[PDB]
Symmetry: D2
């Protein structure tokens, strides 16, 4: 059924104080939105990071997958750069799925990879430690982030 | 040495396109804010969950630690409930540090634990799968959330 | 062209410092979005307030106009309640246009009427003082808010 | 009497449905914060725009009034540029009051002047039509915006 209807029931449950965790139908919908996506925009300009994300997502959906034409480094001026990058992509690209990776919050907070639907809803996300504290090959780090973000909502790669 | 001056310089690196990841100085400030915290507000009404968070943070700070007087279940109507709870606590309680736990994003997106400073900046966070995807005792999960949120920015428990 | 391309151009102008205020085409896009809207959701339960908003918007578009099924008073816990109400409506109802009215910001900040498109972009808005500073019949107040929000982007009813 | 405590009472009124518009005490607090402000930061680099805002605030308060070291035009990549500018200033400058002016929402949506307190709360704001809709010397526009923003919360120039 439609996402708006699934969310409506959840909002009502919360209003009437019977909300007890996520529902099965909610997780299937998130899975369905990701899986049945036809267009994905990855909010990055770095071609390496894009390859990894693209190669991964090509295994779970049959979608046209695109990189961002403009420099999103300016999202690092906002409080949560990763969401900002995703919303930037939402504003300049028509798509079913937006995947953005950048800093979590304040300088020093490390990185977030986030996945948004066509309305900018946060479907899933994953975090990584600061590179100051724990340096790692960025190809393996993104690979692990994407894997967690997908597996935590029931999609296994 | 004040946070504002460090973030400024980080913002300048992004503006002039020389920003290449987080800095050591940035990490120390975040560590300082959390470690030297004297007043902490936990944006929850669940006394169990508060107990776990309080006990953990007392191992890293000598701080007066308080729970929220009001029901934050209404935050679950927003796009990112966990963050909303923190900003609610920020709005009605004076404190050095704010810790909030709730839904990540949309229904089904699992849970987020966040730590905010006195200006609502995002210092660090952690994520967990929905109990639908992975069941777990909520006391051990929350303990795991806080420890990761602390450890990913270099704070040992 | 599509909204996504118009915004892309504007963003490019700001990044590369050729942006000098809004463009004429950008203005037409917002107007077109309001006029050709086929489904409108008013984020309220107040049927009185709904009447005024519905009747006015029927003067500018031939659209299905709907009221919110749920209580949006809990948005008043957020930093900007009116926007929150729009985003709540956006989450649980499929529509071309979302119109929300509520508190601007902090308690005392007065009221905001905001209009959002299907992706939650802010197309236009208008404000009113707290009834503390200037009392007014709420039906004329809202009618006044809506007309200005429409007139400020060049739409006369 | 402290702002967090008045907001708590307001939040409680909204939660248990006793909230009936803004209260007198709330507006006095916003007035105090603005009038008794000791440090004000204007989120701009434009000395003309800074002059007007500074000139105006000097008639209502005796405050140190400062301009931003960095260019906040990149806030135009976010969904609500004026607010983003305010939060950029909040992140990199210690102050009692933050005044930001920029675009309201999407391209074409016109301009917003907003005033934030030291925790990033929206105290008051004003809007202007796009310069496409009504041309005006920007010095008179900003002056009219600020004056509208102050009088609507009860502060006269």
């Amino acid at each position: 059924v439609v996402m708006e209807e699934i969310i409506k029931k959840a909002f009502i449950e919360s209003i009437n104080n019977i909300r007890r965790g996520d529902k099965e139908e909610e997780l299937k919908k998130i899975q369905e939105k990701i899986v049945n996506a036809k267009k994905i925009v990855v909010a990055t300009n770095n071609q390496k990071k894009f390859k990894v994300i693209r190669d991964i997502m090509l295994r779970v959906c049959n979608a046209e997958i695109k990189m961002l034409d403009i420099d999103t480094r300016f999202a690092d001026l906002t409080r949560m750069p990763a969401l900002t990058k995703g919303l930037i992509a939402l504003d300049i690209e028509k798509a079913d799925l937006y995947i953005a990776r950048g800093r979590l919050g304040a300088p020093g907070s490390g990185s977030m990879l986030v996945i948004l639907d066509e309305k900018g809803r946060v479907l899933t996300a994953s975090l990584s430690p600061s590179s100051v504290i724990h340096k790692e090959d960025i190809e393996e780090r993104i690979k692990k982030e994407l894997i967690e973000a997908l597996s935590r909502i029931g999609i296994s790669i």
